[PDB]
Design a protein around this ligand. Structure first.
Ligand SMILES: CC(C)(c1ccc(O)cc1)c1ccc(O)cc1
Ligand SMILES: CC(C)(c1ccc(O)cc1)c1ccc(O)cc1
Lengths: 9, 239, 235, 9
């Protein structure tokens, strides 16, 4: 889940 | 925090969070095909998404939401946000869409791609509207954050989440009025302009949905390349 | 010069309230519940009849008949589904969890499943209705919102006259909120909250238009020439 | 178009 990961990092 | 900001602090915060204007890979000598021009736009969009994601984190109140809610708001609003940014950059160029400082297009070129010309005309028309209203940069940033917070708020204790978003929305409304009042607008003029501004968001939602269907169309045609992030955003809307 | 701009707040409110179309009934079969063909059959039948009243409602919206016939056609073509939907939502307001398509056709989410791809549209509609309820939307506010949709939705796809009338309607909304005792900050806040919902209604219309298109292409139920023309206008 | 006829009728 790219968006989910970018939101975290 | 977000609910504590004054109108001026809100404006400053949003102005400080503004993402940068990126360049395209456009080569004015290189010949344009359907798959290449859309490739440039999709390549550009993909890079803008990364900045948009990190811009959202700086929008007051956004990080106060669960990760699942942030994902939802961005999945819903991403294309509206790209589009309003495009229209804003295009204000000073009647008949042209400034996708990038080195990529200025008109409706003509928006035909190397099938179905693109309709969306372009809507974008240009919105640009005209911004010009007619003499839209202010301070107002633009308010509108953009409104889109992020509002566009997915009705398609989500999980209601305590929605309640906070509405509080922040009211805060941005206050900011807009504050801006208009400073610009010396009468109370009647303020309310009228506020309406005019928010009504634009209806047409921006419209363009986003038309564009979202155009994207799905390009994907299934499998001619133009779509990034993995862009495919997932597109997938969020199903279609 | 349009007679619309010369009207007062009360006069505008009265004209709009007076233009309101009637609440229609659906076919009265009690043992129909409920397949896909029968479901969409009842709804499309209802929509077709509501459209006729909508077209004559529009002509009674101040400033509308001052536009050329072509502008009138354009505005209605663009806004028709948003107008059906906001009407549905308004009617459904005092009925949490349910959509009052007609007094004798009150549907809930489970029934939405009956039709393929309609449960998603149902949930959006139901969420809007609830939102309207929790905002305590008034009938005077509702008619202003509905005519705003009529004049606004297709305005940027074409001007000055329409925006002057739109401003006029904005004055009218504020006029109502002041009349109701709301403070200044509450007035512009409520104005914004109401107008922001129009964005969602637009979204629902776009989704509904796609659903109606697929239902067309499935050739399940025949659609009236009128409903087909309103659908086809969205290409 | 039907809409035209109705708008005038
Ligand atoms: C998503 C897309 C490449 C884009 C890229 C960048 C941008 O600023 C706005 C839109 C796009 C989609 C659909 C469209 O018709 C034009 C552009
Ligand atoms: C056009 C349609 C039959 C309708 C009819 C009447 C109504 O009040 C609202 C909507 C409809 C279309 C698509 C949909 O998903 C639900 C209902």
């Amino acid at each position: 889940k790219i968006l989910h990961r970018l939101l975290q990092e | 925090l977000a609910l504590s900001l004054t109108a001026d602090q809100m404006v400053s915060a949003l102005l400080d969070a503004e993402p940068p204007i990126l360049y395209s890979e456009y080569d004015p000598t290189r010949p344009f095909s359907e798959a290449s021009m859309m490739g440039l736009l999709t390549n550009l969009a993909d890079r803008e998404l990364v900045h948009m994601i990190n811009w959202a984190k700086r929008v007051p109140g956004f990080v106060d939401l669960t990760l699942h809610d942030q994902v939802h708001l961005l999945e819903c609003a991403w294309l509206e946000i790209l589009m309003i940014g495009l229209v804003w950059r295009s204000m000073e160029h009647p008949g042209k869409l400034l996708f990038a400082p080195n990529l200025l297009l008109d409706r003509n070129q928006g035909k190397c791609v099938e179905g693109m010309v309709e969306i372009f005309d809507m974008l240009l028309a919105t640009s005209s509207r911004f010009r007619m209203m003499n839209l202010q940069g301070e107002e633009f940033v308010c509108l953009k954050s409104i889109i992020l917070l509002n566009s997915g708020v009705y398609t989500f204790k999980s209601l305590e989440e929605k309640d906070h978003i509405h509080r922040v929305l009211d805060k941005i409304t206050d900011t807009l009025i504050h801006l208009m009042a400073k610009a010396g607008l009468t109370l009647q003029q303020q309310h009228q302009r506020l309406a005019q501004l928010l009504l634009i968001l209806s047409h921006i939602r419209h363009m986003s949905n038309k564009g979202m269907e155009h994207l799905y169309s390009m994907k299934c045609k499998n001619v133009v390349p779509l990034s993995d992030l862009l495919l997932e955003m597109l997938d969020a809307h199903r279609l």
